[PDB]
Amino acid sequence: DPKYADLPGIARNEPDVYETSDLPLEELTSTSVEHIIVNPNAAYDKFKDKRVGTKGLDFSDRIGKTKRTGYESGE
């Protein structure tokens, strides 16, 4: 303010800012598909006590010794 009062070629009695006036899911509600509510807390409890047998596991494309089925049994 006193800085710009010192200089000669300065804008006096002019507005600093010239601005404009400040101006102020469809598939998920379908009949065809059946809407399920995902509750992981409920899901976690159902699978809680289920185990898998990783002994003698081989999912790879290995030909040796007939067919294999990964995850034998639980407990």
Binding site: E26, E27, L28, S30, T31, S32, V33, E34, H35, I36, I37, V38, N39, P40, N41, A42, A43, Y44, K46, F47, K48, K50, R51, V52, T54, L57, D58, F59, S60, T69, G70, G74
Partner: protein, 370 residues
Amino acid sequence: IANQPVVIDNGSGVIKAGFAGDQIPKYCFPNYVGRPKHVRVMAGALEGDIFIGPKAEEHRGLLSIRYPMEHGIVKDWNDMERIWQYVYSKDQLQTFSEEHPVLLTEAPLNPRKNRERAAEVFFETFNVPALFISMQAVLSLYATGRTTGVVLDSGDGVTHAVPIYEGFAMPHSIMRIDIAGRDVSRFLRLYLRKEGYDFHSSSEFEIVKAIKERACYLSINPQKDETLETEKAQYYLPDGSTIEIGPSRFRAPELLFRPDLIGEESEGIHEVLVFAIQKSDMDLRRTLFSNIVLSGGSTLFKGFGDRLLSEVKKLAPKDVKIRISAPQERLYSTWIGGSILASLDTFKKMWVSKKEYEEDGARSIHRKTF
């Protein structure tokens, strides 16, 4: 291990990361590496030559977008390393990779070299305790809480159908097609140029993806809606300019059901589902038709469920009960499955340890994944 294992759903469009047990993924950001194309002259401008996730979304116009993985195959690994590094950085989960085990979620029938390199990076660059690679479909079933179901997972990169009956997944009945959400956005851009609005820039391609999500409906009859004169629905761009989309709105997403439009000799999304069921043994066909689970973000199209139910019914046998079930969080369904699997004690046996990987090598990861 006392420290919770981190679930990372390495999706083509959006990578969703978070801790096991959490009901929803806390930190989900778009999968791309943003580099500044314009020159830096001033002092105090945005620091770094790499922008990932929400910082990249804010300053999108400044940056040149570059997707690291295309059709569920990591093309540039240097970029894939930086995004996985950003997941562990202060902005997202903010923890050390060495303390938490990881759960990675790749698509089915991807190249073996992808799984090998994915493991190499996650064990060497990050010194993770344990990594388990799993299929997207198997997790989506744990989320809904159902043992029997076929999972039609239409993602950004790839759309696949995996028939799973009473826990077992049939590996020979797996059907995968490259044509997916990102090809629909690419096919939409081509039709927007025909309408007379150009989106050449990599940043402008993200606006085409935004147009696709907001305004695109799948018509129940394709030949009928083609002939009828359509209402030219205006869309507002980021700058303010209005575009009339017109016929391109409904013609673009039809690519998923008819891959002949882009000019790829592959099966349609409707053909993929029925082929996957028809490939399965005679006895289970009726149970798999009854239990259909839609997954991925590209199933959220308006009138997808209506059109698919119409198309499947024609190809499927007469007088069979076809129930298509949609979980409300289709987009996040894959991750939620990961969180439930990770929380179980059985997951401890499933993991490949560092020492187990170090001894055998690449084989150990291929042995234990499906």
